[PDB]
Design a protein around this ligand. Structure first.
Ligand SMILES: CC(=O)N[C@H]1[C@H]([C@H](O)[C@H](O)CO)O[C@@](O[C@H]2[C@@H](O)[C@@H](CO)O[C@@H](O[C@H]3[C@H](O)[C@@H](O)[C@H](O)O[C@@H]3CO)[C@@H]2O)(C(=O)O)C[C@@H]1O
Ligand SMILES: [Cl-]
Ligand SMILES: [Cl-]
Ligand SMILES: [Cl-]
Length: 138
């Protein structure tokens, strides 16, 4: 088991065909999960499942530049469930991050931060037990 919040270095940044796989279990009565792909203090890609936003379940995606959040992209398809194991896979493609959960396509996020080689850390946080966090090239 791994300690949350967990920082996964991405040596030399991200590159197309890099696949990041996160395995864990959502805690009972969870409120949030967050994956933050960082470029220094900036957040290139914030992936943020929210279990209770005005009694709705929603995934919020955004970018933070110079301490300011941008325009949110929201997804109503919500594959997570409190108490249950999950697999998140983030595939870096030339023009977007592609996210699949439990082997099903979920969403894609167009690159707002364009210096991919400088996105060199992934932060994992929220109401989860974290089992594994790794990457490979496909
Ligand atoms: C230490 C700590 O708990 N930090 C939080 C911060 C702070 O709460 C922040 O200063 C706001 O008080 O917020 C963080 O989550 C934010 C992030 O998920 C962004 C993504 O867009 O959304 C923010 O909420 C939005 C909300 O989605 C909009 O509907 C609303 O109009 O504006 C809100 C504020 O911008 C989240 O607060 C953060 O990472 O900055 C979560 C940290 O845990
Ligand atoms: Cl739930
Ligand atoms: Cl692409
Ligand atoms: Cl950039």
């Amino acid at each position: 088991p791994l300690i949350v919040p967990y920082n996964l270095p991405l040596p030399g940044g991200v590159v197309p065909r890099m696949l990041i796989t996160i395995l864990g279990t959502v805690k009972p009565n969870a409120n949030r999960i967050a994956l933050d792909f960082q470029r220094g203090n900036d957040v290139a890609f914030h992936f943020n499942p929210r279990f209770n936003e005005n009694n709705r379940r929603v995934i919020v995606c955004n970018t933070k530049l110079d301490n300011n959040w941008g325009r949110e992209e929201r997804q109503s398809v919500f594959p997570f469930e409190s108490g249950k194991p999950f697999k998140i896979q983030v595939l870096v493609e030339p023009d977007h991050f592609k996210v699949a959960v439990n082997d099903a396509h979920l969403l894609q996020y167009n690159h707002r931060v364009k210096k991919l080689n400088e996105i060199s850390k992934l932060g994992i946080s929220g109401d989860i037990d974290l089992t594994s966090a790794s990457y490979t090239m496909i």
